[PDB]
A paper describes a structure:
We found that PUL16 also encodes another putative [name] endoglycosidase variant, BT1284. However, this protein contains non-conservative substitutions of both acidic residues in the catalytic site, thereby lacking the canonical catalytic DGxxxDxE motif of bona fide ENGases. We found ENGase-like proteins homologous to BT1284 throughout several Bacteroidales species (85 sequences in at least 20 different species) with similar substitutions of catalytic and substrate binding site residues. By enzymatic activity measurements using complex type glycans (from both animal and plant sources) and HM N-glycans as substrates, we confirmed that BT1284 and one ortholog from [name] (Uniprot ID: A0A6H0KVH8), which we named as [name] [name]-like, were indeed catalytically-impaired. The crystal structure of [name] [name]-like revealed the presence of a TIM barrel fold typical of ENGases from [name] family fused to a β-sandwich domain in the N-terminal region ([name]), similar to BT3987, as well as a β-hairpin motif common to [name] enzymes with specificity towards HM N-glycans. Structural surface analysis in the putative glycan binding pocket of this ENGase-like protein, revealed that HM N-glycans do not fit as well as in a bona fide HM endoglycosidases. Together, these data indicate that ENGase([name])-like proteins were unable to hydrolyze or bind N-glycans in the assayed conditions, but may they still play a role in the metabolism of N-glycans in HM-PULs from Bacteroidales by some as yet determined mechanism.
Altogether, our data suggest that human gut microbes employ evolutionary strategies to express distinct ENGases in order to optimally metabolize the same N-glycan substrate in the gastroinstestinal tract.
Numbering used by the authors:
A (entry chain A), B (entry chain B): 42 to 150, 163 to 507
């Protein structure tokens, strides 16, 4: 009586994702009672167990026909111990392998059923055109990250025989361009660093493949500290910036623009004071020029007061497509009186439906025990206990970043909160980020999923 | 309106047999009306049609994952012609192909649905453990043939969705050993040529693999023209020959012996003359020694008279498991009076049930128009129109031999008569000899299925 168990996967029938490279796992035997005498059991492959697995679990899998290299298959179990040595399995990818899920059973002489997912050129097996239920907006810092990593990130939704895969993000924000004065000191202009220039300059390689995979790709525009910005433009300056943004979006085939309201370094006293009214007039002008292309707003603590009320009849929430904050790893509910976690009323935008507000914008930082309690607490209490279910439609991730030492814990969770609420809590569907675990996955701190190639 | 058809196969859905080697075929377009103008069409692969084929024909096929190399895919149809050029298709075997029957639809962009049977290491896909209805006995001339060709010959039984494969033979007779006088001329001794010595000396390679797939393997023992044989032995000579045969079967893991009563060159007038009583006495002693191992008898014109009668209370038909004749390509009915084909009364063995008698023994020789009419006539009239149904149990093929120029016609027929009667006539099941057609098949006169390797 024992259990052939996977060392690196809690699933009793682990599902490995094979994206044109080899995959591997170690398996071991776990006896119910300690071994009396030292015995050596051997693991072997028994592909004749496929049809029985299929009939029971409703699957239609085919035996994995590629080379499977089992090393240290002699499971030595020392006397007095309950868990044997670890055999190592490496599944070998070959281009002859068709894209599907395969089944390779392993027997001890219990049984562990390994399922291998051979990906197609663009997506894993069982990818569906069924769209994501919520809006997942992701940032990419073009200084450290390839925008095309979004086309390598998927959710594993459901359990067999109803397994489906979808892209983890629906909108991708590209960081960044900036607003600066021209050389003459009169007009604003958009400045592009070397990295954001290469991505835009080769959009058929970086932006257009994302769009073919169902992504809306926007350009984030921030401030460059010269005192000119979205909230203090005059009439002539505004027409310039609206024209340049309109041109930029059509020029490089972008789907919209993200207005990041920070790093403008506005002056506190003078004639060009930043106002919410100016911000409303500017976005209204931008909406007229770019039509149905997306406008999103990233509110910060440097944002102007008065967005809670109408400015000259304009409500910013009515003109923008989405809006979120820089209050990372915390759920911001501006519509909650006597909010136990904190008063988020400064983040109230007039005319903005709760469905257009990313209440949770997450970043890849390590969090304390109190920070983790506040995060999970503000998430569950506002969406489930307080009834603010309309705050589960937009989830924002400020920079999909490389997982390194220290941020491994937050790296596993800061992309799954959107699907956790919408799929696991609000429905029955289990969500899982793919390719996360395993060598070469996103959670491998010694690998890069989609690295920068310029 | 047109028909995409195969040149070498008249079936709409050709079933190609892939046994760890590549398989190929040519196709063409046949228009229902001549080409008004000169046009060129192109053929392609549409694995989406796999589903509708499955639903219509009740199959569970999966699209073929291997590489299909199509050449001349542009079909040139000159004006006034109804048939386009030929396109060549090669289906590539690879170790990454699991054993199954795969479907590969081919479209002109009518449809030709190709079915690929990727064999396992031992049998084609859809091989069944269901045993053969009749007993098919096959000889193998070890001087020209490898005994393991029997592990490559199958019957394709039925139609889809009720397709199955069985081995075409149940008993294999290995030619041959000889009985000669010892140096002093007082004892019989078994003699082995260089080829039959190698087969027995490496029975783990040649005999045992046949028995694993369910073959009963016997050794045929004839005469060497030295005047000593099964029918003139005394008491001391009989014990010696019985001992060495019992020893031979035990030594090489054989399942029985075939007593071929020919080429002994018995004396016409003298002291130790051949008699049917002597033969009955020797076989009775062989039955006691080898016990449940098989004794079979091949009667010839050189066989002794009186086998129709009980010799000293012994009936040879009671001690032998099977019996047949050397009267090739003609059904022999010794129990039928006023036989229109021929009086076969001299081939009658006392106490032999008809279910143990192989009335038809086939050999790979070309037949005249009259000889073929005698063959088909005697087979059909005796078993079906005269009601000798018990003569359909045992069928014999004397030397499964290489098909060459001149015997292509008899090559296709002389292995399927037993299945034609028992499966096609007496049941609804359709029989096909696999792997017969195609390059490398048994009917390819420029290839050897399982050749000699010694």
């Amino acid at each position: 009586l024992g259990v052939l168990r996977s060392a690196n996967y809690a699933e009793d029938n682990p599902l490995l994702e094979m994206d044109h490279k080899n995959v591997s796992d170690e398996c071991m035997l776990t006896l119910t009672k300690p071994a009396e005498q030292t015995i050596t059991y051997t693991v072997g492959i028994d592909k004749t167990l496929v049809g029985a697995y299929n009939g029971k679990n409703g699957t239609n899998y085919t035996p994995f026909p590629g080379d499977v290299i089992l090393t240290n298959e002699q499971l030595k179990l020392e006397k007095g111990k309950q868990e044997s040595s670890k055999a190592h399995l490496e599944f070998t990818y070959d281009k002859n392998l068709a894209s599907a899920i395969y089944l390779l059973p392993l027997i001890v002489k219990q049984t562990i059923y390994y399922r291998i997912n051979v990906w197609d050129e663009f997506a894993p097996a069982e990818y569906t055109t069924e769209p994501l239920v919520f809006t997942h907006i992701g940032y990419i810092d073009t200084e450290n990250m390839n925008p095309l990593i979004a086309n390598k990130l998927f959710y594993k939704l459901g359990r067999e025989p109803h397994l489906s895969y979808v892209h983890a993000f629906s909108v991708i924000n590209l960081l960044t361009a900036t607003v600066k004065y021209d050389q003459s000191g009169s007009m604003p202009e958009i400045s592009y660093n070397k990295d954001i220039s290469y991505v835009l300059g080769h959009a058929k390689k970086y932006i257009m493949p994302l769009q073919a995979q169902g992504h809306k790709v926007c350009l984030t525009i921030k401030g460059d500290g010269q005192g000119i910005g979205f909230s203090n433009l005059n009439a002539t300056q505004s027409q310039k910036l609206v024209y340049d943004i309109r041109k930029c979006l059509e020029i490089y085939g972008l789907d919209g623009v993200n207005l990041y309201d920070e790093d403008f370094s506005y002056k506190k006293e003078g004639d060009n004071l930043p106002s919410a009214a100016n911000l409303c007039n500017f976005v209204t002008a931008l909406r007229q020029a770019i039509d149905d292309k997306l406008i999103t707003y990233a509110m910060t603590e440097e944002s102007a007061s008065g967005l809670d009320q109408s400015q000259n009849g304009i409500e910013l929430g009515k003109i923008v497509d989405y809006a979120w904050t820089n209050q990372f790893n915390r759920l911001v509910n501006p519509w909650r009186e006597d909010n136990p976690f904190g008063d988020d009323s400064q983040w109230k935008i007039a005319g903005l439906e709760q469905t257009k507000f990313g209440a949770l914008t997450s970043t890849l930082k390590s969090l304390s025990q109190e920070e983790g309690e506040l995060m999970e607490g503000s998430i569950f209490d506002n969406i489930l206990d307080a009834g603010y279910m309309d705050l589960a439609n937009v989830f924002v991730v400020n920079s999909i970043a490389k997982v390194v030492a220290g941020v491994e814990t937050q790296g596993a969770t800061y992309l799954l909160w959107g699907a956790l609420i919408n799929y696991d809590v609000l429905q029955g569907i289990n969500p899982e980020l793919v390719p996360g675990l395993g060598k070469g996955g996103y959670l491998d701190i010694h690998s890069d999923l989609c690295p920068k190639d310029w």
